[PDB]
Structure formats: C-alpha cells, structure tokens
Amino acid sequence: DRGVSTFSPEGRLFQVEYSLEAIKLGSTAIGIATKEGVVLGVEKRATSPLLESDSIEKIVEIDRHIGCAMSGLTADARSMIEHARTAAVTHNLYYDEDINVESLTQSVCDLALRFGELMSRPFGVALLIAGHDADDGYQLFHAEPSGTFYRYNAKAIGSGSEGAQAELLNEWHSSLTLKEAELLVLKILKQVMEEKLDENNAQLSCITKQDGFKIYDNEKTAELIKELKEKEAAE
Amino acid sequence: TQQPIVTGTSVISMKYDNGVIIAADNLGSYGSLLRFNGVERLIPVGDNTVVGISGDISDMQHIERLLKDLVTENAYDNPLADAEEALEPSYIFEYLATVMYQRRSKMNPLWNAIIVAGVQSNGDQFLRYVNLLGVTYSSPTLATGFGAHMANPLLRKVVDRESDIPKTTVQVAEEAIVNAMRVLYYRDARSSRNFSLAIIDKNTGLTFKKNLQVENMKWDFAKDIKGYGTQKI
C-alpha cells in the first residue's frame, strides 16, 4: 500500500483529493448570504420511500447565531458539529460574548488535517457554515477536509455543485432580499435534484440577527415552493 | 522545600550619572555563624552586566552556571553576538526573574536574593532585584539582607530620588558604597572584612575590583568603655 499523509508528484495530498471525490457523490447543499440574512438549503435524498424524511438532519444548529449545512459522508460531520458547538459554548464561557463566525470556522478547519500515522483518514464531508456577528455582519463559509475555508456571497456543494454554482454566478447581486434568496435556493435545488422538489425531500433554513438560526417547517417551505412555481409561470 | 546550609550576606548597589556600582563581601557563613570565606558573589555576564547573589551558596553556583550557559547559547548562530545581538542586563534579569518565580511555584526555590547591575545598549543604567519568591523591584539604591536595613539608608542620602542620579558622580557613589560596606562589617555577624566591588560605566566599560578590605575603622574609643553601667575600673 502507501502512506496516509503522502504527497502526489503534482504536490497535493492523495487522501485529501480522494475525500473531495466522496463530497461530489454527496447530496446537494446551497447557501446564499444577503444584508437581510443568510439562507441554507439541502437535498434530503431518501434512499427508499419507507424512510421517514424528517429524520434526515443535514442542516444543524451550532449556536443561536451560527447554522451549518453538510454534504458527503454525513456520519463524519457528527464529531465536527460536536467540536463546533463546544468551541462556540466554551468561547462564550471564557469571554462572555458570541464567537466570530470566522473564528468558529477556523476552529472546525483545525480538525481537518489532524489525521495520519489523531484520526486515521481525513473527513469525507464539506460544511457550509452560515452566521452573523457584530463585526463582519452576515457571513457564509465553505469548510473543506483540506483545512482550507473560503468566505462566499453564495456557494453550492455536492453532486449538483458545478451546475448550481454557474447559476448562482448570474443570479446573485448585493441588493438581494431574504424572500428573494429563499426562492433562489429552492429554484436552483429543483434544477439539480434527481427527484421532483417538494417540502419532504428538500429543507430550508436561515440565520437573522433578530431571530437567530431557524430550520423552516415543512408547511412554511411548501408555501415558498408554491410561490416559486407561480412567479416562474407569470413570465 | 529546602533549608539553606551555607549562605552569603548582603549585596549593595546604587546608580550614578554614567552607570551603576555593586559590591558583596567574600564570606560563606554556616548556620551557627561559623565562617568559610573564599566565595565570589559578583558574577560578571559579558562586559555590560554584573549579577550580585546572596543566600544559599550551592544555589548561587547553580545560577552562576546558568548565566555562563546563557552566554554560550546566545553566541550560537549569532554573527552579532559581540555587537547588536549581545546579551543585555534587561534580558539576563528577566531570564533569572522567570527561573526564580517558576522554582517558587514548584515549591523548590533557589534560596537567593539577586541584584542585576548593568548599562543597556542605549546607555540607560539598569538596576533590578529578584529573590526566592520571584518578587522584583527597581530603585536608585538596591540592597539585600542586612544591606536593606543599614546600607540603603546611607545610599539614599546620596540618591533619594531619580533626579539625584545625574548630580551623583562615580567618585561620590564609590565612597558611599565603600563606607556602607564598613558599617555592615561593624554590625553584621555574617559579614567579612574582604569584599569585591564592580563598576559598570557606559563611557569606561566594566571595572571589577577584587580583594578589597575595609579600612579607616574606628575602634580606639573601646578602651574608655568599662563594665555595663556602675563599674569604674
């Protein structure tokens, strides 16, 4: 065989590059950042109709001001979420304040490359970390298993990412309202999803300064799906 | 936790206009005031610093080795070891201060009182004290043990405040230090007649004086003293 922390002749880490392939196989996750909030949406993708879809948790709360969407080997994300929640709460205990979204992301990314021959392999999951703080306002970050994170105005990860990202490129502007962003996530999810989009096989969430991080009910998401269809038929 | 066996007595120092003076007697006393003189308690580190140590002699010799060790280490991969990147009194003091405090915090202290006397690279006089508890303080005059009680009052007549330092010459400061050493010989049972004095001057460098003796002592009046009150003979 070969070492776990080995460099390729091109100068990349084999195990990191291979984990990125695992993330491409994962179900789609989209994030859009605005001045009115940050929206997070995911493709649930139930393997069978008997599987109760509400038990698919691919959008997760880290603190009141920080949400998280995942794509790839989602089991790997459990310990990453545990670490993020501990970091967020621990920082609040030590400094009597909310922790910066960037600082929380940086903390999660410090686990990523703690593997070798520490854990046996890199994580096989990417995270969209969305949040608000007083300093840098509404933020969306993409945390890879490479230990790198980029801030994004909008970002798609998973099977339909390259298609969804090209669509976000055209559609995103700096003056987007929260209602517009919600419909845009739903629009781009319906485009890249295999099965037809409804309130059971897709899930919306947002983080606002006022109400914090909220996962949308199936009833609420259903109305936005109905609103989306009418507006596309209207012209 | 330990008990000091063989100890050195007071170290006295003061600042003058162009530098600092430090002095210490050459005696190692035992528990019941027995002697063992032949002990140098002034450690010159480079040509800009002198470290005066009091308390346990064994711990003093350990600190002496650390300072010798420190100079060697600073020279390693240092082209400017004898110039810009040479050891400073502030560096040497802070190292020692760090060691004294982490030793007291491990409940295994170095049973010493240390005064670091030197001149900095910019010509600023450096005088600072550290002890077995890691307590640190600076003053125009610094002294340990008996010196704090008897030497400081004499030295403070010459330099009571910072503004007096420019007005104080090396001739005046040396006289004050040498007079103070005689008083300690009169009144300290653990003092000795033989002492070492070091001057660090920005203009003239470091001057180290060894095998100095207390002179011009007053004993003549003792002949007139008879009995403890009523004895006339």
């Binding site: 291979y18 109709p49 008997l50 109760e52 038990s55 089991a75 021959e117 854990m119 046996s120 096989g124 | -």
Partner: protein, 240 residues
C-alpha cells in the same frame, strides 16, 4: 499500539473497508422492522442448515438494551455483541446522570457514533453490522424504529429490512405498508412482518423469530406455536 489506517479513501472517493463491511451485512441472516399505530415488531430469519441446535441457550437475535428499547442486527454475530454491550452500558449511564431512560433516537445516535468512530480510527476495522433499534421513549406512546449501518449514518423508518434478500422484502413492504394508515393493532403488525419474511425465509417452522415491543417497557418474544399460527393463516389465505 497498532496504528495502521485500514479505513482510507480510494481515488473514486470510496472507503472500501466500510463498503466491504456492508457486504458482511448482506451475507447476514435477514432482519425486518415494522412499526404500527401503538407497537413496533422485529422479525428475524434463522438459517435452517443448523439442526441439533439448543434453542434454549443459543444467543437470541433480538437483544434488550433497556426494559423499553430492543436491538436486532444483520452481519457478523461476534461484532454485534460489542455494540450491544456498549449500548447497554450507555443506557444505565444515561439513567444514572440524566435520571431518565434513553430516548430511542439517543441510543441509536450513540450506537451509530461507535460504528462511525471505527471508520476513522487507526488499527481497527469497521463493524460488519447494521442494526434495527426499536422501542418507546419514556412516558411516550409514539412508536420509534431506527436503522444504523457500518459507515455510522442512522435514520428513522416506518418499516425497514436488512441482511440477505433484504431488497426483496423491502420491495414487499414498499407496496404493502400504507403511511396514511399503519397496522392499527398488534396482530395486523405481526402478520405484515411474518408475511414480509415468508417472501424470503423458506419454511415458517423454527426459521422465524418475532419480538413485539409496546409502550411502558412491555416487550415479549413469541414462541414456535404462536408464530406457527400466523404462518398457517397466511398460507390458507394465499391459496385463492
């Protein structure tokens, strides 16, 4: 200690040791979970190539984790014992610190966590085991049925099957189980479970095990004669 990374990524982004663990599950004897309106039933296959067995003492396929939660499995029997022990210890640990028995979701999340940890720890191979965890949360009458697998992913199921020919019995349940109206009674739920196993088993003699879990720590295992009555009823109705 033995440190080797056995579970690692391949160029195509797969973890073969986790995927080969699923193959061990596919080789395992069939296990089915069907949750009704006021009950959950766990059906388990026992291969009939083993005669002269002592059914009294032989390890039972369904294990009580607490008085209110049960765990069935498909895959390596020896591996299952380690997950069952860890789960049973965690169940008593939860009662001791939270002063409340585990929820079915919590016990599942723990077992799935153990299975996950063995997929990115040095010196260990993944568990060759998928589990069905069924029961009722304390002071709750809503039936719970969860599935775990070697990767460490878990999820809730109206009804689910694992092990050999599970795709056949999943096919059956997908058309025979109504979400809008689940099995109303115990009899209805047990019958649908036995029916689903009779698509795969061979004979309905000492080859089918049934365990019925009801609210407030009411778990009972059915005997041969009790199960045999359901087999006799289904076969007579089939001939039409």
């Amino acid at each position: 200690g033995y440190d080797r990374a056995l579970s690692i990524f391949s160029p195509d982004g797969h973890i073969f040791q986790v995927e080969y663990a699923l193959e061990a599950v596919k080789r395992g004897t069939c296990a089915v979970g069907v949750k009704g309106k006021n009950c959950v039933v766990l059906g388990c296959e026992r291969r009939s190539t083993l005669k002269l067995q002592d059914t009294r003492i032989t390890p039972s396929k369904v294990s009580k984790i607490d008085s209110h939660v049960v765990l069935s499995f498909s895959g390596l029997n020896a591996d299952s014992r380690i997950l069952i022990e860890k789960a049973r210890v965690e169940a008593q640990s939860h009662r001791l610190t939270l002063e409340d028995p585990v929820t079915v979701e919590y016990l599942t999340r723990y077992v799935a966590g153990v299975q996950q940890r063995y997929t990115q720890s040095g010196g260990v191979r993944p568990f060759g085991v998928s589990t069905l965890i069924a029961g009722f949360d304390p002071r709750d009458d809503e039936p719970k049925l969860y599935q775990t697998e070697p990767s460490g992913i878990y999820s809730s199921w109206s009804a689910q099957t694992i092990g050999r020919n599970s795709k056949t019995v999943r096919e059956f349940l997908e058309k025979n189980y109504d979400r809008k109206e689940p099995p109303a009674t115990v009899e209805e739920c047990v019958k649908l479970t036995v029916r689903s196993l009779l698509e795969v088993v061979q004979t309905g003699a000492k080859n089918i095990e049934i365990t019925v879990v009801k609210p407030d720590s009411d778990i009972v295992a059915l005997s041969s004669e009790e199960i045999n009555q359901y087999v006799t009823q289904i076969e007579q109705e089939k001939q039409e």
